[PDB]
Amino acid sequence: KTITFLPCNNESLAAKCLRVLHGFNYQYETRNIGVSFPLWCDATVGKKISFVSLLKQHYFVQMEQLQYFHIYVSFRRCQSIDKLTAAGLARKIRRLEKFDPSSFAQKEHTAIAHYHSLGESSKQTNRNFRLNIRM
């Protein structure tokens, strides 16, 4: 089904829907159901979220009671974009030591094509990351 948001921020709201899809897949140990957004426009991810192959989980039911809900292409994570930040460039060098560290050099000119990260976090640790998703 397609869940259409009608109240806002589509970035930090579609990322919450995937965390419920995340925690569902470790209770039941299933990896079949996938996610895609029909309105994947350049300005924003969109207000439409669909799953193909969840609505009985506690998140989607309580959000349904309020005024806001309704309840080919490939969307894959690109973790090379997580390596392009300068905190991630230092993570890359620490592995290669574990050797001249001054022999390395920055790119000084990089171009990035439409990475669309959705911000999420971990529950095993207290640590944050992003969902850099392209077509």
């Binding site: 300068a86 905190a87 230092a90 060098i93 620490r94 001249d100 560290p101 001054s102 390395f104 050099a105 920055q106 790119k107 000084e108 000119h109 990089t110």
Partner: protein, 303 residues
């Protein structure tokens, strides 16, 4: 007193661009580079960071650079020669030099630093480069700078530079910043008539390198103004002295203590200084603000 149709001075303090370097272990230096928003960070195996620039103190305050009225020209030369005799240059030269000797010209890079050191190399000088080791521990207040072995000899340079028709006083400043691993560095950035931040850069060897600008550095030496009403914190010395966190003007013309209202009272200040009764603190505060804007220079015209 009227403002003339031509009145302009030159600046008496001339800073330069600040260049950044990366010191590797076994002590070799490499100019810092950055990526492209632009982001600049310390490389991984680096030890610390050098910063270097130069400041001159070159007495342009004594006479106007351009003045089409001989009555207003003689009004300056009485003010500078009476400020020098009655008050002296010890207060302003101390307040300028403390911004060099701590890391005031290192704007947000002092932030989250382990320790930083400043080494001066004054030019009309014999030897033994003046060192300021471990600021944020050793050099906290005004009395901490005065307890240095040679602080009087460097304050008396800037006093001699202002008190002479050819005073020169060149300083070669060099800093040593010990940052955390993969730490931020915040250089200055360009002005675009428009997140989308571009750095100001030069060329050292064959590589781009961030700078901290020459006009940005002079705005950090001249954060002295605290003589305005309330005076919670120092303000960059300027006419109708503004703050830039909040877009406000303290010393507005409605206050009556901007630089253009103190110019009309500059004839009044000569008989106050030529008497024998010591002047009140409020009047001298307006004399410190009068002198610090002539060190800053600028067009002072009208019509």
């Amino acid at each position: 007193m009227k403002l003339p149709t031509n009145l302009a001075y030159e600046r008496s303090i001339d800073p330069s661009d600040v260049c950044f370097f990366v010191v590797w272990p076994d002590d070799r230096k490499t100019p810092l580079t950055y990526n492209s928003v632009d982001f600049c960070h310390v490389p991984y195996g680096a030890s610390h960071i050098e910063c270097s620039f130069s400041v001159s103190f070159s007495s342009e305050l004594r006479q106007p650079y351009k003045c089409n009225s001989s009555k207003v020209k003689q009004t300056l030369v009485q003010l500078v020669e009476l400020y020098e005799t009655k008050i002296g240059w010890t207060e302003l030269a101390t307040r300028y030099l403390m911004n060099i000797c701590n890391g005031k010209w290192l704007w947000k890079n002092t932030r989250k630093a382990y320790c930083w050191n400043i080494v001066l190399t004054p030019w009309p000088w014999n030897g033994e480069k003046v060192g300021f080791e471990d600021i944020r521990t050793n050099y906290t207040s005004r009395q901490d700078f005065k307890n240095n072995k040679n602080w009087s000899a460097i304050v008396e340079m800037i006093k001699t530079a202002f008190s002479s028709t050819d005073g020169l006083a060149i300083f070669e400043v060099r800093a040593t910043l010990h940052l955390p691993t993969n730490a931020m560095v915040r250089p200055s950035q360009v002005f675009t008539e428009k997140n989308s931040r571009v750095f100001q850069s030069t060329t050292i060897d064959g590589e781009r390198s961030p700078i901290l600008g020459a006009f940005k550095t002079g705005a950090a030496i001249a954060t002295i103004d605290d003589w305005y009403p309330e005076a919670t914190e120092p303000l960059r010395v300027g006419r109708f002295g503004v703050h830039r966190e909040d877009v406000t003007c303290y010393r507005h013309p409605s206050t009556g203590k901007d630089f253009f209202s103190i110019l009309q009272q500059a004839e009044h200040y000569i008989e106050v200084l030529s008497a024998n009764k010591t002047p009140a603190q409020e009047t001298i505060n307006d004399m410190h603000f009068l002198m610090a804007n002539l060190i800053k220079g600028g067009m002072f015209q009208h019509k």
